[PDB]
Amino acid sequence: MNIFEMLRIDEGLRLKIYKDTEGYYTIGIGHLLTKSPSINAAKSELDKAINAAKSELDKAIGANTNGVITKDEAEKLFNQDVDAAVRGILRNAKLKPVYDSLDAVRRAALINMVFQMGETGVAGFTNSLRMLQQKRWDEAAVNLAKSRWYNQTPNRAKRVITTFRTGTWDAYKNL
Ligand SMILES: [Cl-]
């Protein structure tokens, strides 16, 4: 197990644009494109939003994709996105010290969160980050679950939280 295999499990692999639970058009292995309008937002609004997502994808791939990519392309955006998550952690004054204090497995769990919620979002978990830095694993686990993140994607958050709790890959074994 490693950060790529871990995120591939949590994000899945879809070759056509889809909408995630937060309302973001997404594709590949968790590659976020743009926000979608209301399930009502006018007939025009919808087409606009979809074309805006297709435009973002074309820009990312460097080709006219029409909202569909190959597995190889999804893996390329994934390599870029994992790289970006790590880079985000290292340039952030709040996340870097926590990342540096963690072991490899727990580092992967932090990259997983940043990949899902972005640098700024994770850097805002001030109390959980402090508990992680203090190696108070069970306390950090309890605190991390008190979040919209956990409530919206509980099965995934539980695996990430268990990874911070144990410092092992047990939550991803047999998946
Ligand atoms: Cl991109």
UniProtKB/Swiss-Prot annotation:
Keywords: Antimicrobial, Bacteriolytic enzyme, Cytolysis, Glycosidase, Host cell lysis by virus, Host cytoplasm, Hydrolase, Viral release from host cell
Statement: the UniProt record of this protein carries the keyword Hydrolase: yes
SUPFAM superfamilies for this protein: Lysozyme-like
Keyword Ligase belongs to the record: no
Pfam families on file: Phage_lysozyme
Induction of its expression: Expressed late in the viral replication.
The reaction(s) this protein catalyses: Hydrolysis of (1->4)-beta-linkages between N-acetylmuramic acid and N-acetyl-D-glucosamine residues in a peptidoglycan and between N-acetyl-D-glucosamine residues in chitodextrins
Enzyme Commission (EC) number: 3.2.1.17
Outcome reported for the amino acid change (mutating residue 20 to C): Nearly no effet on specific enzymatic activity
InterPro entries, per the entry: Endolysin_T4_type, Glyco_hydro_24, Lysozyme-like_dom_sf, Lysozyme_dom_sf, Phage_lysozyme-like, T4-type_lysozyme
Effect of residue 128 to F: 10-fold decrease in enzymatic activity
One of the protein's GO biological processes: viral release from host cell by cytolysis
Gene Ontology MF terms in the entry: lysozyme activity
Annotated effect of mutating residue 26 to H: Facilitates transglycosylation more effectively than hydrolysis; covalently bound substrate
Binding site for substrate: 32, 115, 128, 143
Cellular location(s): Host cytoplasm
Family: Belongs to the glycosyl hydrolase 24 family.
Name by which UniProt lists this protein: Endolysin
Species for this entry: Enterobacteria phage T4 (Bacteriophage T4)
The gene coding this protein: E
